[PDB]
Amino acid sequence: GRRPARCYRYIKNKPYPKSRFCRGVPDAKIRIFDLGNKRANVDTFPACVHMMSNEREHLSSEALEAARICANKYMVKNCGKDGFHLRVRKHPFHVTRINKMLSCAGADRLQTGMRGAYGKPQGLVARVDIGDILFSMRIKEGNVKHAIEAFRRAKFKFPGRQIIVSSRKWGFTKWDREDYERMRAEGRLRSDGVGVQLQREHGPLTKWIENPI
Amino acid sequence: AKSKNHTNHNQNKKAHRNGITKPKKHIFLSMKGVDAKFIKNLRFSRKNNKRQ
Amino acid sequence: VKVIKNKAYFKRYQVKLRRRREGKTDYYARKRLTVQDKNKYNTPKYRLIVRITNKDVVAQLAYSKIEGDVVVASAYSHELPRYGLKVGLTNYAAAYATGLLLARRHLKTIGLDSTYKGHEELTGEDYNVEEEGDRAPFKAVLDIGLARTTTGSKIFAVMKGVADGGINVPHSESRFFGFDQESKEYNAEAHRDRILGKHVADYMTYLKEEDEDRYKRQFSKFLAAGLNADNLVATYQKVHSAIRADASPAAKKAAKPSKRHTAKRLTYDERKQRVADKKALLLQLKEQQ
Amino acid sequence: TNSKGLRRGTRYMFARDFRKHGVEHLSTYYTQYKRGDLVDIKTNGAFQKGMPFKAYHGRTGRIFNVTRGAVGIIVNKRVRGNILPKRINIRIEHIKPSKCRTDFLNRVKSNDEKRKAAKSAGQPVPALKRLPVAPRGAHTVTTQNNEPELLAPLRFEIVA
RNA sequence: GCCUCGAUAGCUCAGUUGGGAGAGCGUACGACUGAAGAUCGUAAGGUCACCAGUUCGAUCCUGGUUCGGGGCACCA
RNA sequence: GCUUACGACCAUAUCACGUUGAAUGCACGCCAUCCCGUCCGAUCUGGCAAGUUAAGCAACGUUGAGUCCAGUUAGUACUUGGAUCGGAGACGGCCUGGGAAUCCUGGAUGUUGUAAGCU
RNA sequence: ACCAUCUAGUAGCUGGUUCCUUCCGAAGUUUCCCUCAGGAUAGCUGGAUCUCAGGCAGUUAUAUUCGGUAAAGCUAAUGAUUAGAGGAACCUAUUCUCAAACUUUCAAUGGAUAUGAAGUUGCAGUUUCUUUAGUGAACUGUCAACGUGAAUGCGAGGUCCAAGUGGGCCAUUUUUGGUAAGCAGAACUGGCGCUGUGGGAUGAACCAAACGUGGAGUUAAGGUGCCUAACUUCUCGCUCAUGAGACCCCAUAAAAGGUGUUGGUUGAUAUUGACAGCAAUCAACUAGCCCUGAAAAUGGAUGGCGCUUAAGCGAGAGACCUAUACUCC
RNA sequence: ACUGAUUUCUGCCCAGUGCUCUGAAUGUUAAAUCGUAGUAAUUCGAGUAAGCGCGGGUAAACGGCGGGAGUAACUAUGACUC
RNA sequence: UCAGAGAGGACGGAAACCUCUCGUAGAGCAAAAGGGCAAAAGCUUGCUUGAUCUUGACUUUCAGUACGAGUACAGACCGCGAAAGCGUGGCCUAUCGAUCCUUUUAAUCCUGAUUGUUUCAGGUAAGAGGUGUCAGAAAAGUUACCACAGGGAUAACUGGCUUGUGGCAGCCAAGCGUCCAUAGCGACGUUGCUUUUUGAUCCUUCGAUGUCGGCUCUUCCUAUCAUUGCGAAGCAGAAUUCGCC
RNA sequence: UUUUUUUUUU
Ligand SMILES: C[C@@H]1C[C@@H]([C@H](O)CC2CC(=O)NC(=O)C2)C(=O)[C@@H](C)C1
Structure with missing residues (x-):
């Protein structure tokens, strides 16, 4: 069976990503990372909520997927599949190791002790720090209550302490809502699907004319 | 009974116990390891210079 | 098709040395040609540069320094009309x-x-x-x-000329005219004839016999200068004699006044004004189209 | 334990600088080195012959021999409680003139010139000693067009 | 757990340095027989266990993965 | 204001497109008996001077890319030394000194030596 | 088998190794060894002294340099990796998250060198080296002149003979293996070992401070209700716990909760009379103390007794007590 | 030497290791002997016994004595087959 | 001038060869990895033997010993090049060996001491034959019939730290529970507790702490099976479940 | 030299 999370909770070793040196790493449990109305236009979901961590620990792929499913079910049932866009902002890339030992009577005969104790891959965990964003979501201003309740329900699936906050930014973009609105009215921000691109000044006036800013 | 146990714990203290000895000042005077041709010419020059 | 010369390519690009980019200096050979042994210190090492352009021959004497070579002497074929020859330079x-x-x-x-x-x-x-x-x-x-x-x-040929003039140029006769690569034999008579230009006179006679029109087309200005296939060798001998008689450089003239012939770079204000004018014009065209 | 090869751990030490590979510029060879001069050692990976050992990289030494295309240098090396003046034959490409000694020589030249000039002109012998920067002296500051600004600490703001 | 060995037609087994994939039985066709079986004359057939690399070209040579099989797993 | 030979620093010099180019020069260019080298006078080599600035090359242009410099980021990140400092811990702040780098913003677009020459 | 002798057989192993004072005073680290309980070797240490009377330094300043770790970057190369956008894949510009064996860039600490007399200017000789060349390089001379060129501290250097050691351990920070370990392995420095003394009730390592033998005074850390020398001293708050809490290492406690109480943040209603019943109120948060979460075996531990406007928790003030420490005798 | 009254039986294997029997066997073999060269020490070569190597026997000598697939008018199993 | 890309050309196709553009090295350089390299260190080709003879100095390991490897010179004779120049093996970082003995090469060498000649033998100098446990003994097992000097530097039983494993208890609720997440359970996750499991370690004990189980006899702890007093049920009652003191 | 079989009732 899987070892308790307390064994690999805290960050102690250097990063151990899957590479040519570490082979035979089992697939991580969490595969999906963007749920809800992911293909939404930038303006569909102006309100944004973050779920930050207050601990420097390891978030297992199992825990990440558990929180994902919990929040996704809550929002699908309370607000519809096409009313939100949830983004898991943390990917499990750190590999933990286990030094398996036999646990039957007489195991000491075949046990190797501490000689050559380098472990084998066990699972994929995501290294987290204080202030790191675990979950993010963009929704309509009339669904912030559901967003906060969903993040509340999900945080109990993670170890340690998490804090749910609402961001001043326009959805997942990098501009506060007021500046985003002003720049979009001006013509400096071009739709980039979920996000937007800044249209800088410099360059040939031939492309300038296509959108005079 | 493992007995490899290498370390560098007290070695700096031992080295500084008697002070770190800097190199002498006459080491730059010897012509050891200088070019043989140059040394030969120098020997010829020194052999011939008139004292007075 | 994926673009090759992109932003990352230009970011990572390293330009070769200026003269290698210009395809004018071979630095591998230059290092061996110009670098002096460190135990000879600042004693100059002298190099005889030989170059042949489409219309001129350049011979120079130089030695290298940290801030550029120092040319000490020079002679050009276009300077021969003072010692005779007007053509075949x-x-x-x-x-x-x-x-x-x-x-x-x-x-x-x-x-x-x-x-x-x-x-x-x-x-x-x-x-x-x-x-x-x-x-x-x-x-x-x-x-x-x-x-x-x-x-x-x-x-x-230039190297042989310098060596005959009396400058010690280390060399071998292997790559002189008249040296047979197969038998490794040297024909001093053939080399002398080539130096005196007998090949040019032979070509003149050959073309004159073959076709008059081709002969004229090939030696137009030779005839205008009055050089034919029976005088060239004597002309070259006289040129050698004159060179050996006098070799001081020609005197320098006065510095004429100079005026700008090329455009001068616009200023910052001029560039910004042009930007504004183009913006206004483009907006006008967009409105009117 | 580590292997004891010559170039162990020199991956970045012996590498060229980014966008700096290729042909070696010729001022390196044109530079003049004389016995008694001080030179810094910085290995050039592009020249595998006459390389200095990794322990002498970034160290300054004094030339004692000048060969065709190399120099013998005396470099101090720490070995336990003694500093050994090791002798190494390094090629020119791994060598660079040291500027500390030339700066000191310039200062000595200036000192001698000032002393000679003052003595010839009859002036008193001037001060020729470097002094540590002394504490700032007394002065006055005017507030005209520079009125003091009252500063206070700022309140905490939740920056999401 | 450690140390080895093997994986090739439907089945059982060879095979070469690396340049052919074979042997037997099985399957299909024709013949002999009243018919079947034996017998005779033909044909087609393999995941070269999977992957990556090495060289002109790899079933073969090298490394890793999956399955199976063998030996050891002792003191007190 | 320029051209050539040889350079030094090796993009502020590179790259893209375009305009102009007086004089020297460079270059393209014509020919292939001879020297010389090729399947091929394309390259290389040799003899020349009808023609051209078309290209190279030089100067200039571009709200040009790159490169370079500066500002901002920011006294921020990080960090030396101190505490019978806070906290269960992870960590956090304070005292004492050092102190960055991206994004973004603005500017610059080769300098120069020896020799010879043009204007 | 037994008896005598070789025989006091050899032992890198165990045990012991006998008077007093004075001075100095370590190592468990390097290399080689059929080497790992042992040696030789260098290091650390003692003694004898000898040559002299300014050049050195576990410290700074100035000048010049080396590095690729922290931070930073991947909308820069390599390797991963989510999502769409504009022209099923493909191209373009983006985007989320990463690297011990990635990096354009790049600290702080850190390393090295130089900072004058063994120097600087000239003049005047030598060379078979070097140059086309007194052209250079170097040297030589009882050559001529100039005179100490950052701070602070301080006497410096040389030779010989030889011991013990060559099981280490602990701590702040960094760090590898391991689920962890009073586990195993490393880096810098300081310690214990070798070391007593005041304090932490007790302790090899913690805090203070190192020691001849005495005295007076003052303190460090720590403390002042009684054990116990020093105040039930002074000011403001918080806390009631059916065994509260009580001082670095340190002698366990978490997620989650409380309509206990005390402060704060935000948003509303309210005197055009706010909530309850036929004059402030409401809601969500936040963090101090307290409570629940909180189960182990002989009877027992803030050290004990006890303490509740404390003798507890936090911020502070006067004075006072006390070292083998500091001053003086 | 092994086995171990009586009764009833004592199967297959001589490939391995032993033991043993023949030898024509120039396959391999020491000392001695013989020949060659040399002035001699000495060098080269030839023979050269037993043994070993070739052949046969022997297990109441030491000892040893297999795998994988398919298959029967319900299934199962597998007399049978490869 | 490479890897590669784009665009063209009978058979020719995704892939044969030819052609033109672009191409910062994305190729190649005997091998592992990392550095380095573009008129080259890569590819093609010509000629060659500097992979030769000789002594010192130095770097690396380091005791500043040796071997090995390498660096910069000096003397000789050479190779390539028109020349400057380059060359003592491999672009650099690994690719290897003491004493004794044997063997070979070298001098028109030295010695065999009663005088000489020739064999023979021994020496001086440089290589090879090898020690891979690679600073270099010539080396198969078993002991339960066992012995000695020691070791808690070192294992097996207890004790000590740790708790992966073992056991026990919590938090959010996706679902089960005819409907109903919480009567009673509770996945995906996650927080703790305990030392009646087995492991990890090797701190104490090897000049000895008698090492399983049972019997007998005390006392203690509860995480409560029964009984006392209670609260809650998917509690109408023999019965049964959960919870509290 | 080799030469095995022929479903039940009629
Ligand atoms: C060169 C190598 C070694 C040599 C010989 O055996 C070495 C000697 C060494 C020593 O000192 N004493 C001895 O008894 C043997 C020999 O015949 C071969 C193995 C080859």
């Missing part, structure tokens, strides 16, 4: 004459011409200036640049 005879002029000129300048006269009788035999008295002959190492080293090349 690129052939073997002109190259040899330019080399001889350079050698005599620099020996005069450094005051060794009287001590070292070199070979004053053109015979085509290999000649190495032999040390006379106490002062050894001036020494230079040949620099051909990017020219191919073939037997009978005009670069080696």
Whole structure:
């Protein structure tokens, strides 16, 4: 069976990503990372909520997927599949190791002790720090209550302490809502699907004319 | 009974116990390891210079 | 198709040295040609640069420094009309004459011409200036640049000219004209004839016999200058004699006033004004289209 | 334990600088080195011959021999409680003139010139000693067009 | 757990340095027989266990993965 | 204001497109008997001077890319030394000194030596 | 088998190794060894002294340099990796998250060198080296002139003979293996070992401070209700716990909760009379103390007794007590 | 030497290791002997016994004595087949 | 001038060869990895033997010993090049060996001491034959019939730290529970507790702490099976479940 | 030299 999370909770070793040196790493449990109305236009979901961590620990792929499913079910049932866009902002890339030992009577005969104790891959965990964003979501201003309740329900699936906050930014973009609105009215921000691109000044006036800013 | 146990714990203290000895000042005077041709010419020059 | 010369490519690009980009200096050979042994310190190492343009032959003497080479003497084929020749300033005879002029000129300048006269009788035999008295002959190492080293090349013609003038240029007769690569034999008579331009006169006669029109098309300005296939050798001999008689450089003229012929770079305000004008014009066209 | 090869751990030490590979510029060879001069050692990976050992990289030494295309250098090396003046034959490409000694020579030249000039002109001998920067002296500051600004700490703001 | 060995037609087994994939039985066709079986004459057939690399070309040579099989797993 | 030979620093010099180019020069260019080298006079080599600035090359243009410099980021990140400092811990702040780098913003677009020459 | 002798057999192993004072005073680290319980070797240490009377330094300043770790970057190369956008894949510009064996860039600490007399200017000789060349390089001379060129501290250097050691351990920070370990392995420095003394009730390592033998005074850390020398001293708050809490290492406690109480943040309603019943109120948060979460075996531990406007928790003030420490005798 | 009254039986294997029997066997073999060269020490070569190597026997000598697939008018199993 | 890309050309196709553009090295350089390299260190080709003879100095390991490897010179004779120049093996970082003995090469060498000649033998100098446990003994097992000097530097039983494993208890609720997440359970996750499991370690004990189980006899702890007093049920009652003191 | 079989009732 899987070892308790307390064994690999805290960050102690250097990063151990899957590479040519570490082979035979089992697939991580969490595969999906963007749920809800992911293909939404930038303006569909102006309100944004973050779920930050207050601990420097390891978030297992199992825990990440558990929180994902919990929040996704809550929002699908309370607000519809096409009313939100949830983004898991943390990917499990750190590999933990286990030094398996036999646990039957007489195991000491075949046990190797501490000689050559380098472990084998066990699972994929995501290294987290204080202030790191675990979950993010963009929704309509009339669904912030559901967003906060969903993040509340999900945080109990993670170890340690998490804090749910609402961001001043326009959805997942990098501009506060007021500046985003002003720049979009001006013509400096071009739709980039979920996000937007800044249209800088410099360059040939031939492309300038296509959108005079 | 493992007995490899290498370390560098007290070695700096031992080295500084008697002070770190800097190199002498006459080491730059010897012509050891200088070019043989140059040394030969120098020997010829020194052999011939008139004292007075 | 994926774009190759993109932002990352230009970010990572490293430009070769200026002269390698210009395809004008071979640095691998230059390092070996110009670098002096560190135990000789700041003693100059002298290089005889030979170059052949489409219409001229350049021979120079130089030595290197941290801030650029120092050319000490020079001689150009276009400077031969003072010693005669008006045409054929690129052939073997002109190259040899330019080399001889350079050698005599620099020996005069450094005051060794009287001590070292070199070979004053053109015979085509290999000649190495032999040390006379106490002062050894001036020494230079040949620099051909990017020219191919073939037997009978005009670069080696210039080198032979300098060596005959009396500058110690280390060399072998292997790549002189008249040296047979197969039998490894040297034909001094053939080399002398090529130096004196007998090949040019032979071509003149051959074309004159073959076709008059082709002969004129080939030797138009030779005839205008009055050089025919029975006078060229004597002309080259006279040129050699004049070069050996006098080799001082020609005097310099006065500096004429100069006026701008090219456009001057716009200022910051001018560039911004042009930007504004183009913006206004483009907006006008967009509105009117 | 580590292997004891010559170039162990020199991956970045012996590498060229970014966008700096290729042909070696010729001022390196044109530079003049004389016995008694001080030179810094910085290995050039592009020249595998006459390389200095990794322990002498970034160290300054004094030349004692000048060969065709190399120099013998005396470099101090720490070995336990003694500093050994090791002798190494390094090629020119791995060598660079040291500027500390030339700066000191310039200062000595200036000192001698000032002393000679003052003595010839009859002036008193001037001060020729470097002094540590002394504490700032007394002065006055005017507030005209520079009125003091009252500063206070700022309140905490939740920056999401 | 450690140390080895093997994986090739439907089945059982060879095979070469690396340049052919074979042997037997099985399957299909024709013949002999009243018919079947034996017998005779033909044909087609393999995941070279999977992957990556090495060289001109790899079933073969090298490394890793999956399955199976063998030996050891002792003191007190 | 320029051209050539040889350079030094090796993009502020590179790259893209375009305009102009007086004089020297460079270059393209014509020919292939001879020297020389190729399947091929394309390259290389040799003899020349009808023609051209078309290209190279030089100067200039571009709200040009790159490169370089500066500001901002920011006294921020990080960090030396101190505490019978806070906290269960992870960590956090304070005292004492050092102190960055991206994004973004603005500017610059080769300098120069020896020799020869043009204007 | 037994008896005598070789025989006091050899032992890198165990045990012991006998008077007093004075001075100095370590190592468990390097290399080689059929080497790992042992040696030789260098290091650390003692003694004898000898040559002299300014050049050195576990410290700074100035000048010049080396590095690729922290931070930073991947909308820069390599390797991963989510999502769409504009022209199923493909291209373009983006985007989320990463690297011990990635990097354009790049600290702080850190390393090295130089900072004058063994120097600087000239003049005047030598060379068979070097140069076309007194052209250079170097040297030589009882050559001529100039005179100490950052701070602070301080006497410096040389030779010989030889011991013990060559099981280490602990701590702040960094760090590898391991689920962890009073586990195993490393880096810098300081310690214990070798070391007593005041304090932490007790302790090899913690805090203070190192020691001849005495005295007076003052303190460090720590403390002042009684054990116990020093106040039930002074000011403001918080806390009631059916065994509260009580001082670095340190002698366990978490997620989650409380309509206990005390402060704060935000948003509303309210005197055009706010909530309850036929004059402030409401809601969500936040963090101090307290409570629940909180189960182990002989009877027992803020050290004990006890303490509740404390003798507890936090911020502070006067004075006072006390070292083998500091001053003086 | 092994086995171990009586009763009833004592199967297959001589490939391995032993033991043993023949030898024509120039396959391999020491000392001695013989021949060659040399002035001699000495060098080269030839023979050269037993043994070993070739052949046969022997297990109441030491000892040893297999795998994988398919298959029967319900299934199962597998007399049978490869 | 490479890897590669784009665009063209009978058979020719995704892939044969030819052609033109672009191409910062994305190729190649005997091998592992990392550095380095573009008129080259890569590819093609010509000629060659510097992979030769000789002594010192130095770097690396380091005791500043040796071997090995390498660096910069000096003397000789050479190779390539027109020349400057480059060359003592491999672009650099690994690719290897003491004493004794044998063997070979070298001098028109030295010695065999009663005088000489020739064999023979021994020496001086440089290589090879090998020690891979690679600073270099010539080396198969078993002991339960066992012995000695020691070791808690070192294992097996207890004790000590740790708790992966073992056991026990919590938090959010996706679902089960006819409907109903919480009567009673509770997945995906996650927080703790305990030392009646087995492991990890090797701190104490090897000049000895008698090492399983049972019997007998005390006392203690509860995480409560029964009984006392209670609260809650998917509690109408023999019965049964959860919870509290 | 080799030469095995022929479903039940009629
Ligand atoms: C060169 C190598 C070694 C040599 C010989 O055996 C070495 C000697 C060494 C020593 O000192 N004493 C001895 O008894 C043997 C020999 O015949 C071969 C193995 C080859």
